[PDB]
Design a protein around this ligand. Structure first.
Ligand SMILES: COC(=O)C[C@H]1CN(c2ncnc3[nH]c4cc(F)ccc4c23)CCO1
Length: 167
């Protein structure tokens, strides 16, 4: 039993809710919140900008030190950093950004990072400003992640479409 509330169960291990991931993280304080990161960990907008703003820019400060030490992530890759006031840990995962021309096949590699964590609160990778089709992202999630994932979808209209079209 865990503390996630109001989710629709899609599969054995995937759950979905119309929610603001920032507000959901603030309430649940999950072990892991996933950030929709880019390779530079520049958290300017979308989910990343919202998560970083909620940490009062502490996420960005920590991220800048990470990059100065380690260099950029790979598209499809991830790193574990602090969850600050939102979660124990933040798993920064880089999905391909279609608006940069990145290969959508890398979306499966991106979701594989979730399998290193037993339970996660996450957004749909490569959705929103990353330019992928969220219906496709949900399909890849369900077909790739085997650990327990609670998906937060900000837009109510999109949430209803994702549920109604789910096979
Ligand atoms: C348009 O709706 C989509 O297609 C998906 C969007 C929105 N993203 C989010 N997902 C879950 N919670 C979210 N809180 C946020 C707060 C913000 F200031 C910005 C984005 C999000 C956000 C996912 C990727 O892009």
């Amino acid at each position: 039993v865990n503390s996630f509330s109001g989710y629709l169960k899609l599969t054995d291990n995937v759950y979905i809710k119309n929610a603001d991931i920032v507000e959901e993280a603030k309430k649940v304080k999950p072990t892991v919140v996933v950030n929709a990161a880019n390779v530079y960990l520049k958290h300017g907008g979308g989910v990343a900008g919202a998560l970083n703003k909620a940490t009062n820019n502490a996420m960005q400060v920590e991220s800048d030190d990470y990059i100065a030490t380690n260099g950029p992530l790979k598209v499809g890759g991830s790193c574990v950093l602090s969850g600050h006031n939102l979660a124990k840990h933040c798993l920064h995962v880089v999905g391909p950004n279609v608006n940069k021309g990145e290969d959508i096949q890398l979306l499966k590699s991106a979701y594989e990072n979730f399998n290193q964590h037993e339970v996660l609160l996450a957004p749909l990778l490569s959705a929103g400003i990353f330019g992928a089709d969220p219906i496709h992202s949900l399909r890849v999630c369900v077909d790739t992640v085997r650990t327990n994932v609670y998906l937060a979808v900000f837009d109510k209209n999109l949430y209803d479409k994702l549920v109604s079209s789910f096979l």
